[PDB]
Amino acid sequence: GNPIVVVHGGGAGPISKDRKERVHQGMVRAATVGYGILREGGSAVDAVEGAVVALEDDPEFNAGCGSVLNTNGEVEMDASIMDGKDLSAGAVSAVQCIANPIKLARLVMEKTPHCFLTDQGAAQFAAAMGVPEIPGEKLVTERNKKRLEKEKHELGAVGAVALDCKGNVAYATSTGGIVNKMVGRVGDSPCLGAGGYADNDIGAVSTTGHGESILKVNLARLTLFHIEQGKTVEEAADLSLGYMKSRVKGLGGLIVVSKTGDWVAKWTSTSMPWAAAKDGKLHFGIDPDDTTITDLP
Amino acid sequence: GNPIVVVHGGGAGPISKDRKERVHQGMVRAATVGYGILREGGSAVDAVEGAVVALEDDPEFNAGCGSVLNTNGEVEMDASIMDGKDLSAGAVSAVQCIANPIKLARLVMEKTPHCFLTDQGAAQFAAAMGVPEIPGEKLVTERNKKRLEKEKHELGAVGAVALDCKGNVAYATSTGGIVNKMVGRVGDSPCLGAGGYADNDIGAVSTTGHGESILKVNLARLTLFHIEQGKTVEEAADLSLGYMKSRVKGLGGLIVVSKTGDWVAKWTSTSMPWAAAKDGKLHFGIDPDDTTITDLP
Ligand code: NA
Ligand code: NA
């Protein structure tokens, strides 16, 4: 089978002229890691995790380092990961002082009889697993400090989907949330069916945008229902995002990969950084009708 | 239209002959409150909340007072509530030292721009709203201390669905989780699409059983997808519960109410206490195909 990886940044407004190149490099890097894992025969779960670790470590993206700040100027993160073979999953919410929430979500999946850990319990589990505690300041960027001050005086998670050489599908979603959010606010990112969904019998979805809207419509599972009903990945993505817009006035985006290798990146927001790698080619874009295709050997 | 309320207890193993009468009285009381709200012209949301507050206050049920204990012998609770008209929702996870997590979930829905709060931030929000702090000890029961010791030395959430006189549907789900759970473990109950789902265009579902399994299959939203495809409420519940059993080896139960007034209580566990009130009649049961019908003014 031909493996595919699709990655996305936040499903938010227009991006600054010079920030677009840092964003472009970040998306290329995430898709390169994801695809590289797939091309050596790695699993879909390792591919989506690898892609999302890259975006968490990148201060340009709203996950890990570069996470938006809550009302107290702190970084509180959420993440979920799912394997489409057995529907096994791991999720974390309101996590702090760790570099990679998606790796902690992977440890919840592999090392516990549970799939979702939160706040104090997720921090205690991270310590028991030997996950290093990093100072909160190391996750905080200057651009985010300014965003918080701007907001106080008046978006979207990162993710990845993959299809591996064995026919397995997976998704990973990670976020810092929304600027100036309440303490302990949980978005759609750690919630299965909302932040993403992966099932080998259908495909895999990872979403971004206004978390409350994504939660209310169960955006990731809804997209896969349309595929089950015979719609293409493009029709499914349009129908489910269109429904979020009309029903709950929510904007956002998503990436999909079907079990047959069809993929798409769609959004109702102004932009959504995205990249896809398949058959030695890299597809990239931010704005509608700005897609670039290059060789990815 | 003719309003309906359906309530459920934990979808778990067999119940002792003497506890069966206390559970019965509890189910009757929850459905009486729910139905009483509906009969005076109250909303579906108020009805499901009223029914679940009764089960939270009842020490016989795994929600509020009577919640199972985590690995530290503490009560950590989850709850979600959803409004079918606009898909508005409120949810809380890992909440402590409050009598009624469903009322706090209602507060998240009505008083914040968010739908889900967790642990410390949920505790801080409860204090800011004037919700009284109760000694976490007032939620702990002797039977649950013994259960924890038994488990260490070696189930299921409560809920309600309703259809009101104006055609609105709602669900409420509340839990103490699973005995000896890890600190900060989040189950299906506060996760929209898993713990429940409400949509006026389809109906409302509230689930119970093994939370991790319910999360992985998105049990509540899945049930409603079968209704959308033309299945009866009975076929939808059987197909959704059957899929959870075959795909992730999970057992549990659910209650459904369609927008047209059809309702059902189904489970794959040994038992599931349930009660339904419609057209002045009360339907009650715990074991398969053993149902009592009485008049309910
Ligand atoms: Na980052
Ligand atoms: Na109770």
Swiss-Prot record, chains A, B:
Record-level GO BP terms: asparagine catabolic process via L-aspartate; proteolysis
Residues annotated to bind substrate: R185, V186, G187, D188, T208, G209, H210, G211
Induction comment from the UniProt entry of this chain: By 5-alpha-di-hydrotestosterone and progesterone.
Recorded superkingdom: Eukaryota
Tissue: Expressed in brain, kidney, testis and tissues of the gastrointestinal tract. Present in sperm (at protein level). Over-expressed in uterine, mammary, prostatic and ovarian carcinoma.
Subcellular location: Cytoplasm
Record flagged with keyword Secreted: no
Record: active site: A157
UniProt GO cellular component terms: cytoplasm; cytosol; nucleus; photoreceptor inner segment
Regulation of this protein's activity per its record: Glycine accelerates autocleavage into an alpha and beta chain.
SUPFAM superfamilies the UniProt entry points to: N-terminal nucleophile aminohydrolases (Ntn hydrolases)
Pfam families xrefs: Asparaginase_2 (PF01112)
InterPro entries: ASRGL1_meta, Ntn_hydrolases_N, Peptidase_T2
Keywords of this entry: Acetylation, Autocatalytic cleavage, Cytoplasm, Hydrolase, Protease
Post-translational modification remark: Cleaved into an alpha and beta chain by autocatalysis; this activates the enzyme. The N-terminal residue of the beta subunit is responsible for the nucleophile hydrolase activity.
Enzyme Commission number(s): 3.4.19.5, 3.5.1.1
Main location: cytoplasm
Family the entry assigns: Belongs to the Ntn-hydrolase family.
Purpose: Has both L-asparaginase and beta-aspartyl peptidase activity. May be involved in the production of L-aspartate, which can act as an excitatory neurotransmitter in some brain regions. Is highly active with L-Asp beta-methyl ester. Besides, has catalytic activity toward beta-aspartyl dipeptides and their methyl esters, including beta-L-Asp-L-Phe, beta-L-Asp-L-Phe methyl ester (aspartame), beta-L-Asp-L-Ala, beta-L-Asp-L-Leu and beta-L-Asp-L-Lys. Does not have aspartylglucosaminidase activity and is inactive toward GlcNAc-L-Asn. Likewise, has no activity toward glutamine.
Assembly description: Heterodimer of an alpha and beta chain produced by autocleavage. This heterodimer may then dimerize in turn, giving rise to a heterotetramer.
PANTHER family recorded: ISOASPARTYL PEPTIDASE_L-ASPARAGINASE (PTHR10188:SF41), L-ASPARAGINASE (PTHR10188)
Protein name per its UniProtKB record: Isoaspartyl peptidase/L-asparaginase
Protein's organism: Homo sapiens (Human)
Top-level taxonomy: Eukaryota, Metazoa, Chordata, Craniata, Vertebrata
